[PDB]
From a paper:
Fructose-1,6-bisphosphatase (FBPase; EC 3.1.3.11), which catalyzes the hydrolysis of fructose 1,6-bisphosphate to fructose 6-phosphate and inorganic phosphate, is a key enzyme of gluconeogenesis and glyconeogenesis and, more generally, of the control of energy metabolism and glucose homeostasis. Mammalian muscle FBPase is about 100 times more susceptible to the allosteric inhibitors AMP and NAD+ and about 1000 times more sensitive to inhibition by Ca2+ than the liver isozyme, and it has been hypothesized that it may be catalytically active only upon association with the muscle isoform of aldolase.
In the present study, we report the first crystal structure of muscle FBPase in its active R state. Thus, whereas the quaternary structure of the inactive T form of muscle FBPase closely resembles the corresponding conformation of the liver isozyme, the cruciform R state of muscle FBPase is dramatically different from the planar arrangement observed for the active liver homotetramer. Based on the structural data, it might be hypothesized that a crucial role in the stabilization of the R state is played by the residues forming the leucine lock between subunits C1 and C3 (and between C2 and C4). This unique hydrophobic nucleus consisting of six leucine side chains (Leu11, Leu13 and Leu190 from each subunit) is disrupted in the T state, which emphasizes the role of hydrophobic interactions across the tetramer in the stabilization of the R form of the enzyme. Even more importantly, the leucine lock motif between subunits C1 and C3 encages a tandem of Asp187 residues from the interacting subunits, which are paired by a strong hydrogen bond, after at least partial (hemi) protonation, to additionally stabilize the R form. The R state of muscle FBPase, which shows the highest sensitivity to thermal denaturation, has the least compact structure and the largest solvent-accessible surface.
Residue numbers in the entry:
A (entry chain A), B (entry chain A), C (entry chain A), D (entry chain A): 8 to 19, 29 to 51, 70 to 122, 131 to 140, 148 to 331
Write the structure that this text describes.
C-alpha cells in the first residue's frame, strides 16, 4: 500500500539505559557509513558519554580503557555496562549488570545484552532475558524497527566457522572436530566453511543460519583471544537466549567467574547439537 | 525507547493505484531533494508510467499534456486520474475518478485525492472520502508513515493568503474582503498575511493553521489562474473532507461542471467561517 | 557520467569555528527533518557546546539566553558569536566578531556571518567578507557542498515582502511604498507579493530572486520586531556582501551601535534600487 | 572545514553505458538496503532496462536469462554487456565488450568491467583498461565519488580464501597449496584464512588486503562453480588491471575461449606471487 503506522516498542532505568545505548549505536552507525584509530576513539567516547548521561550507570568497562570507569556521583544509577564500542562489516557489543568488583560478575547475572552489526543495514540483536529480538536501524527516523521477535537458532546447522590458518596451533579437540566436519563418518555431506574474521559478523551469521563459531584455545593463545566481559559473555547471553550453547570447551561461558576485567577466554558457540558434538571431542 | 514496530496501513484496484501514485511521489521527492523544465518532464513521465503500470487506469489528464492520455488496452483498469505532477517548496496534486468525457466529471464524483508537499519533510495529505490523513515519507523505508488521522481545519482562522500585489486588478469582493481583514470593524485584531506563492504550500498551511487562501477572479484573469481538474478540485476535495469550504465565489468548486480539461477557475478555500465571510462580500 | 571527485574547500581559528558552526547546523538539520520548545532547547545546546568546544570563542550571545555566555578559560579563543539557533521552512542565523561589551559591536565589525535554511535541501549562505558563497548540506557525507560562488543580488527586483496584515499600524513611509508597488505611477506592472513568515526563508528568496523584504517600525512595535545582534546584523552582512542594501529606514543596519544584546531594530533589505526607493519614501 | 567542491569525473557511447550501469547499481543498492528471488528479478530488470535505454547496447547476457538478450533495433548501439545483477554483503558484476557470438569473446577483449559491493557503504571497482578506480556511492547526491585511483594489489599477501569444507573433494594441487599455507616449510607464519562466501566480498578483500581467492575445480564440480562470462572474466579483468593474476589453474582466465554463455570455469586469483605459487602446485 506503501503506507505504515508506527508504534512505540518496549523490551519486556534499564529502559533509559538501552535508549542511550541505542542512541550511541545510531551515532556509531553514521560514523562508520562515512569513513581507523580515530573511529575507535570516537566510538568509545560516544558510548561513555551517552551511558553516563543516562543517569542509570555507576561502572563501565570498555575494551578501550585500562581501568573501569566510575560514574560521577550526580549521574550515578544502578547499572554496570561492559562493552566493546567498535569490534572488528564491524560491530558494537555490550552487556548490562546490576567499584571494579561490580563488573566482575559471572555472565549468568546479565540483565540485558546485545550487539550491533554495521552492514548494508545496521542491525541490533537485543535480549532482556525473555528471548532475542532483532531490530534494523531506520536512520531517517533515527529509530530501531523490530524485524524479528524471539529469534531461535537451529538445533543443528551445516556451517563451521574458525580461522583454519591456525591449524598448526590447534588443540587436539579442535583438530578432531574440524576433521569430522570435513570427513563425516556417517555418510552425510561435509559442513560448509565460513569465516569473515569479524566476530559479530560471524556470530550473527551463526544465529540466523545455524552451525558453529569457534575461537578456541590454541598453542599461541592458551586462553583464547576474545575478551570475557564485553565480547564472549554478551554473545553467549544472546546465543543462549536464542536456544544455542556457548562454552569455553570446559564450562559454559556464562558460568566463568571473571578474574580481571580484560580477561580472555576461549569461545565456542552456536547450534546446540554442534556445540555438544564439539564438547564430546574435548 | 528508540524502538518501534511497523504495521501496514490501508485507506478505508484503488489500493494498487494509490500505491503507484505514492511510489511516483517517492521518486519525485528524491529528484527534488537533489536538484527546471527537466524536472517537470521527469515528474510527468514517472507519474504517467507508474499509473499505467498499476493496471488500474484508463484515462489520465496531466497538467503537462495537451490531450488526455488513454491507457493501452492491456493495462486498462476502471479509474481516471487528473494530476499536476510538479506544481510551484513545491508539490504534486492528484484526483481520482471512476474517452476525455471520463475526466470531465464534477469534483463531487472524486473517489480519492491528495497532494504531496516537498519540504524538509515530504508530506502527503490523502483522502478516500472518509476524512483526511497526513503522512510523512520515510525515505529509508521507502514508505509513507501515518502522522495524523482525520485532520480537521479550524472553524475560523486568523491568516489570509493571496497575492496582494494584484490589488489594482482585484474584483470588488476581494477588495472588500481584504479591507475587512486589515481593518476589522468589530474591535478584533487584523488577520496576519502569508503567501508563499506555491499553491500546495499555501493550501497546506491553510489546512494545518486555518484561515483562508484565495486565487480569485481578477481583471487580468477573469477565470482565475488555477486549473479546475488537477489543482482546484483535488484541493477542494481535501479541504472539504477536513471540514472547510472551497468556492469559486459563485458556487462550490466541486459542483462546477468542467467544460475542458485545462479549464481554469477561481479558487477561495479554507476555514468555513472565513470562506462564508468572503461569500458575503460577493 | 555519474562520477565525481571531491576537493576540500576553504573560505578565504576562524576555520575551526566555522567548522563547528557547520557541524551544529548539520545536527540541527537532522533534528528538524525528523520532527517545538524542545527543538529550540536542543538547537541552542548543540550550538553552544560545539562553539565552545572549538576552542575559538570567548563570548556567545544566543537568542535563547538572557545573558551573554562566557567561555570557560580552558576553551577560550578570540572570537565572539551572536546567533539565533532556530528561527521561525525555518533557519539558523549567526554572526562572528573578534565581557558583554565584546558582543555589542557595530555590524560593520563582522568577520564572518551566515544563515542556514532547512528546506527540501539544507542550504547555508556564508560570507567571510569576500562575497557570499551558497552551500548545500550532503547528509550522506556530512559535508557542505559549494553550489554557487560570489552570489550577487539583482540591482532591482519585482517582489516585495512584508506582513500586509499590519496595514493599520504602518508608518507613513511603509504605506507610501506599498502603495507604489501596487500602483506604479510610471506605467510599469505592479510588483508581486510574497511573505512566508519565516525571516530566513524570506531573506533567502530576496537574495536569489531579488526585490525587497521589510519588517519596519510600526505602531505596535516602534523599534521593529527583529533582533539586531543575531538576526538583522547577520542578514544585513550577507545581503551587503551580495551587493544589496540593508537599512533601519534611518541608517544602515551595520552602522547601528548596539545598546543591549537583545535590542530590536527595523529591517528593510534587498536589491539596492528597491531599498533606495524605500528610503526616498522615508 | 566541513566544506567541499564537486567536479565531474570521467574514466579515461561507452560513457553513456557506464552511466546507465551505475544508475542501475544505484537502484539495486537502494533495494538491498531496505530488504530473495524478488530482489533477483528486480535487479535483473533494472539492469536490462537501463542498459537498453542507454542506446549503447546490442547484446546482453545475464546470469538470470537462459538466452542472450538482443537489443531492439531502435535502441541498438555497439556494445555487449555480460553481467550478474545480484550475486551472493552481496554484489553486482559486469563486463563490457564491443548475435550470441558477440558475447562469447575471450576476456582479453574486455573494454570495461566492474563490480559493486553492497556493504555499510556501496562500493564500485571500475576499470576501462587504464587501471582500477574505486568509488563510493553517495546516495544523497545519487553519484559515485572517487575514493582511490589506480588501485594496486600487493605482490604477495598473507590471507587465503576458499571453502575448506570441500577438502574431501579437493584436487591434488589445492590440497598441496592449502597444506603449504597452514604449514609453511620456510620458517614463516601460516597464512590467515578468510571466506565470506559471497564472491564479490571475497574478491574485494583480496584486492584491498592482498592474498589469494580460490574456487578451483573439485570432484563435485570439475569445471568449477563460478561463471566465465559475468563472474570470472570481469573479476579477472579488475584484478589484472590492479597488478594481480587470475588463472583457471591451467591458463589465464582472460585467455579462455568461451564455448557457451553460462559456461563455468575454475577461478584462482589475487596477489601475483600467491597465484604463481598455486600454479607451481599444479
Amino acid at each position: 500500500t506503501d503506507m505504515l503506522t508506527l508504534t512505540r516498542y518496549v523490551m519486556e532505568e534499564l529502559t533509559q539505559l538501552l535508549n542511550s545505548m541505542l542512541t550511541a549505536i545510531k551515532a556509531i552507525s553514521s560514523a562508520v557509513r562515512k569513513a581507523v584509530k580515530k573511529l575507535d576513539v570516537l566510538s568509545n567516547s560516544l558510548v561513555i558519554n551517552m551511558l553516563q548521561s543516562s543517569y542509570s550507570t555507576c561502572v563501565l568497562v570498555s575494551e578501550e580503557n585500562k581501568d573501569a570507569i566510575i560514574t560521577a556521583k550526580e549521574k550515578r544509577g544502578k547499572y554496570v555496562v561492559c562493552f566493546d564500542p567498535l569490534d572488528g562489516s564491524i560491530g558494537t557489543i555490550f552487556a548490562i549488570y546490576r567499584s571494579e568488583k561490580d563488573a566482575l560478575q559471572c555472565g549468568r547475572n546479565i540483565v540485558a545484552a546485545g550487539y550491533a552489526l554495521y552492514g548494508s543495514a545496521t542491525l541490533v540483536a537485543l535480549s532482556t532475558g525473555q528471548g532475542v529480538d532483532l531490530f534494523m536501524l531506520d536512520p531517517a527516523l533515527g529509530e530501531f524497527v523490530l524485524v524479528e521477535k524471539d529469534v531461535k537458532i537451529k538445533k543443528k546447522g551445516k556451517i563451521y566457522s574458525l580461522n583454519e590458518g591456525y591449524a598448526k596451533y590447534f588443540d587436539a579437540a579442535t583438530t578432531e572436530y574440524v576433521q569430522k566436519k570435513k570427513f563425516p563418518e556417517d555418510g552425510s555431506a561435509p559442513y560448509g566453511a565460513r569465516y569473515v574474521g569479524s566476530m559479530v559478523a560471524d556470530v550473527h551469521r551463526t544465529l540466523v543460519y545455524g552451525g558453529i563459531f569457534l575461537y578456541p584455545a590454541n598453542q599461541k593463545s592458551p586462553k583464547g583471544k576474545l575478551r570475557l566481559l564485553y565480547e564472549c559473555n554478551p554473545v553467549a547471553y544472546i546465543i543462549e537466549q536464542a536456544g544455542g550453547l556457548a562454552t569455553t570447551g570446559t564450562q559454559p561461558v556464562l558460568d566463568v567467574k571473571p578474574e580481571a576485567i580484560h580477561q580472555r577466554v576461549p569461545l565456542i558457540l552456536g547450534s546446540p547439537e554442534d556445540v555438544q558434538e564439539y564438547l564430546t571431542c574435548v
